């Protein structure tokens with residue numbers, strides 16, 4: 001699991017969004033596996049505004065942070081699961097790395113800050129949902 005807390009927002013994987021996330025919906029994108037809900041107290045996570053393709057991500061199946069190089073945000077065909085049917089998820093960055101379903105939520109970080117959260121995985125690869133384009137998060 002896991003989330004990013006920036007300002008008066010909470011950023012989770014859409015498929016893991018709780019009842020309170022839906023009761024306080026701000027923005028959501030099924031094809032991005034993203035959901036933004038509102039928070040009462042002030043979040044202080046810094047979002048990265050960069051062009052990076054190297055980062056370090058947290059992996060709870062190992063309790064380890066991994067240094068990885070990843071692709072630029074794009075459309076990747078994500079196989080069917082119980083949360084979604086066979087579809088193309090947009091804004092997804094792929095890296096060669098380990099992951100398990102319970103790892104969705106771990107953050108990929110660079111020197112600039114928070115790049116995105118773990119979203120997909122399979123075949124010795126791990127995918128991250130990018131959040132760097134969401135400029136409205138800091139205002």
Ligand SMILES: COc1ncccc1CC(=O)N1CCC[C@H](C(N)=O)C1
Nearest residue numbers: 033078081099100101119120121122
């Ligand atoms: C090895 O499998 C995994 N590895 C990491 C995270 C997640 C998985 C499982 C996986 O691919 N998905 C299940 C949950 C929703 C995902 C999505 N965004 O479409 C797809």
Ligand SMILES: [Zn+2]
Nearest residue numbers: 050052110112
């Ligand atoms: Zn960066």
